[PDB]
Amino acid sequence: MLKKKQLTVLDLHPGAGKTRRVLPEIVREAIKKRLRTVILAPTRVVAAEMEEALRGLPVRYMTTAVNVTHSGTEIVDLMCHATFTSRLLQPIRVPNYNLNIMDEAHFTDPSSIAARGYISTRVEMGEAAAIFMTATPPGTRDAFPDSNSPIMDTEVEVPERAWSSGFDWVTDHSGKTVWFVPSVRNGNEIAACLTKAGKRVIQLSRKTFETEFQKTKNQEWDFVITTDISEMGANFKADRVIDSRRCLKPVILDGERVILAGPMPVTHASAAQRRGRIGRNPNKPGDEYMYGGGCAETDEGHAHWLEARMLLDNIYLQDGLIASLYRPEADKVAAIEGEFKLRTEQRKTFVELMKRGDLPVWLAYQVASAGITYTDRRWCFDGTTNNTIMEDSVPAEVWTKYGEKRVLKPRWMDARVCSDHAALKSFKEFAAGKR
Numbered sequence: 282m283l284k285k286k287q288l289t290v291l292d293l294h295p296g297a298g299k300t301r302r303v304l305p306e307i308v309r310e311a312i313k314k315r316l317r318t319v320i321l322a323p324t325r326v327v328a329a330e331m332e333e334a335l336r337g338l339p340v341r342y343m344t345t346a347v348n349v350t351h352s353g354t355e356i357v358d359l360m361c362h363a364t365f366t367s368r369l370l371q372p373i374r375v376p377n378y379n380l381n382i383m384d385e386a387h388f389t390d391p392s393s394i395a396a397r398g399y400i401s402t403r404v405e406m407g408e409a410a411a412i413f414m415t416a417t418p419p420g421t422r423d424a425f426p427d428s429n430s431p432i433m434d435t436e437v438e439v440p441e442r443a444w445s446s447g448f449d450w451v452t453d454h455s456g457k458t459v460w461f462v463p464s465v466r467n468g469n470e471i472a473a474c475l476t477k478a479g480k481r482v483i484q485l486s487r488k489t490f491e492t493e494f495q496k497t498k499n500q501e502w503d504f505v506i507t508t509d510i511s512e513m514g515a516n517f518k519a520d521r522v523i524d525s526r527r528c529l530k531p532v533i534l535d536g537e538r539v540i541l542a543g544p545m546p547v548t549h550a551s552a553a554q555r556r557g558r559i560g561r562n563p564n565k566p567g568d569e570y571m572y573g574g575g576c577a578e579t580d581e582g583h584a585h586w587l588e589a590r591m592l593l594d595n596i597y598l599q600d601g602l603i604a605s606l607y608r609p610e611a612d613k614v615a616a617i618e619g620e621f622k623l624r625t626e627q628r629k630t631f632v633e634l635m636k637r638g639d640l641p642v643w644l645a646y647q648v649a650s651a652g653i654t655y656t657d658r659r660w661c662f663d664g665t666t667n668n669t670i671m672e673d674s675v676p677a678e679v680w681t682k683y684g685e686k687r688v689l690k691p692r693w694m695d696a697r698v699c700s701d702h703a704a705l706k707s708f709k710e711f712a713a714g715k716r
């Protein structure tokens with residue numbers, strides 16, 4: 282696999298041992314052949330699991346999720362998918378790795394799509410080798426792959442709101458359940474209903490993942506309520522998965538605003554990854570998978586692929602050349618390569634609005650391309666009346682950096698800045714000039 286000019290897709294079924302068995306063998310061979318290597322983890326939790334599988338081997342951990350005293354003799358680096366893309370964008374030299382390994386290469390967040398695009402272009406140019414590790418590569422049509430032990434698959438109606446009757450099977454179970462919901466707010470309602478019935482519930486989402494995941498090992502629990510983030514290598518000691526089969530979809534309207542459409546069906550790749558949380562122990566057959574809807578190709582026209590093109594257009598590759606998206610996922614967006622390329626000063630603002638400002642890629646692009654500097658927050662207050670942000674069914678209010686109380690009304694509206702209580706609190710701090 283390690284030979285230059287080659288991209289290999291390691292597609293063994295979920296639980297086959299790609300991370301703990303195959304990955305250390307690849308690393309040993311790359312070290313023997315003196316190949317400068319990079320290993321890409323989707324989250325900080327998976328990075329910690331990788332250190333346990335690679336313990337003893339000379340690997341340089343470029344993350345604070347691991348506490349190691351590095352010897353300085355390493356030719357293998359390990360970092361998260363988002364860290365790789367961030368360093369490419371910033372004015373810091375990233376080595377031209379001979380071997381590029383991506384674990385959980387099915388991750389559809391914008392920085393993961395960008396990393397696949399950049400790596401596959403280098404391979405196509407005859408410069409590097411690459412290995413994409415996932416049971417569900419882009420374009421998969423099989424929601425029910427093989428597992429370590431048989432799974433009981435049942436199509437059933439799954440509640441998406443609090444309930445009084447009709448779903449006895451949910452609370453009559455005596456094991457442990459991992460329940461996938463379409464959003465943070467939807468999960469809050471189901472958690473409240475279960476807690477009222479005497480159940481012990483843990484909630485997981487992108488912003489709380491590392492902290493709350495530790496609770497699954499440190500305390501007794503009956504249910505885990507989670508968004509699609511737990512599709513990226515999160516492991517649990519459970520015997521049942523409840524899957525709504527629904528997700529939210531960011532959509533750009535008239536190139537003017539971003540809305541969160543849905544809930545709508547998940548892809549076959551997501552359904553297989555959600556199902557893949559159970560049936561992992563070969564000695565424990567009979568884990569249950571309850572699913573409440575069908576699959577569809579909802580990644581076509583999804584804003585993450587447009588945002589990935591915005592990142593790739595602002596990454597240096599060679600003179601005026603721009604990296605393409607990974608071939609099996611390129612038709613998900615209607616975009617001309619190079620149309621989002623910014624000049625030096627606007628690019629610097631774009632990077633800082635994402636890195637320090639914590640704004641979504643699309644929103645960061647509108648501000649930077651309009652010629653506005655990072656600290657200038659006048660655009661958060663001069664939008665039209667129909668862009669007013671609502672807090673508890675009443676217009677949200679902030680004190681500006683000048684000391685004036687103003688209604689939050691952004692020139693560009695992106696629904697992700699107010700999708701939950703935590704997101705709106707962080708966007709209020711940005712509008713006030715607090716970061």
Ligand SMILES: Cc1n[nH]c(C)c1CNC1CCCCC1
Pocket residue numbers: 497498499500501517518
């Ligand atoms: C380590 C681990 N992973 N998943 C589960 C479940 C556990 C057990 N944790 C409990 C915590 C409370 C005391 C007993 C041990």
